[PDB]
């Protein structure tokens, strides 16, 4: 059965929503990443990566 909202309702009775962003951070091929710009692949030297 269906609910029903109305503007005149008070706090709590107002409508709310929910979102669940499931993630997976194990060592696997990446499909989504942040806006971190990619630098150059310096090789053969002690560097942080």
């Amino acid at each position: 059965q269906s609910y029903g909202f109305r503007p005149t309702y008070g706090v709590g009775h107002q409508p709310y929503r929910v979102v669940v962003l499931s993630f997976e951070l194990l060592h696997a091929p990446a499909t989504v990443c942040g806006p971190k710009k990619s630098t150059n692949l310096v090789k053969n030297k002690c560097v942080n990566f």
């Binding site: 060592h27 696997a28 091929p29």
Partner: peptide, 18 residues
């Protein structure tokens, strides 16, 4: 139509992408 056989050492796959 039906029959029964054995899988000696079959049914193996990499658990994770590592």
């Amino acid at each position: 139509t039906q029959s029964y056989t054995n899988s000696f050492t079959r049914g193996v796959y990499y658990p994770d992408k590592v």
